[PDB]
Amino acid sequence: IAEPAMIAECKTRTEVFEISLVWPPCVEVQRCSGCCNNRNVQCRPTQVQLRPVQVRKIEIVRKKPIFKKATVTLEDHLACKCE
Amino acid sequence: EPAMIAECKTRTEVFEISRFLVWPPCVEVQRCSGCCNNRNVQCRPTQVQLRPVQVRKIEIVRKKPIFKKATVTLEDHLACKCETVAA
């Protein structure tokens, strides 16, 4: 029936990041997720990256439907390591 | 091409284990994440599956460590469909 547990080996995993209405709200971005043996050892990033994304910047202000377009830079995580 | 939405489906996540070191400190389980069109349309599970797993509950005793076996029970998310929710 029950199988043994397997460590969440530490690598790049997909995460859903909501932006701070927009469209697209949230967006998919990489991030180190995972565990290290010696509990004191910690799993963190060894190379990050920047990818700016264009965003529809809707502007529903004073009875003025006047949307815009912003740019929001994302932080990806290209390759992690426990340390 | 600018930013596009994160389809609402299921992507794996790591989930920490809460008790006495308990190896594995954390397993990957599958969870429902993503977005929708309205502010009150949420990416929610449509079927979950309840899977048990074995963990070694290491307790150090007197001058020696024991390797107690134990079954935590995880919850996998198998489906997902943007749902209607006053929210």
Offer a quick outline of the entry.
Chain A has 83 residues and is mostly beta strands.
Characterize the structure shown.
Chain A: It is found in: Secreted. Chain A: It comes from Homo sapiens (Human). 2 copies of one chain form a homodimer. Chain A is mostly beta strands. Chain A contains no helices and 9 strands. Chain A has one domain (1-83): Cystine-knot cytokines (Cystine Knot Cytokines, subunit B, Ribbon), CATH 2.10.90.10. In chain A, 0% of the residues lie in helices and 58% in strands. In chain A, the strands form 4 sheets. In chain A, strands 2-3 form a two-stranded antiparallel ribbon. Chain A is elongated. The A-B interface holds A 1-8, 13-16, 18, 21, 23-28, 33-36, 39, 53-55, 72, 74 and B 2-6, 11-17, 21, 23-28, 33-35, 39, 51-55, 71-72. Strand 1 of chain A pairs parallel with strand 5 (48-61) of chain B.
Structural features:
two-stranded antiparallel sheet, Platelet-derived growth factor subunit B (chain A), Cystine Knot Cytokines, subunit B, 83 residues, 0% helix, mainly beta, homodimer
Please report the two chains with the greatest interface, counting residues with C-beta closer than 8 angstroms to the partner's C-beta: A-B, 30 and 30 residues
Envelope shape of chain A: elongated
For this entry, what is the oligomeric state of its chains? homodimer
Relevant CATH superfamily of chain A: Cystine-knot cytokines
> What is the CATH class name of chain A?
Mainly Beta
Largest β-sheet summary of chain A? 2 strands, antiparallel
Main location (chain B): secreted
GO molecular function, one term (chain B): identical protein binding
Subcellular location (chain B): Secreted
GO cellular component, one term (chain B): Golgi membrane
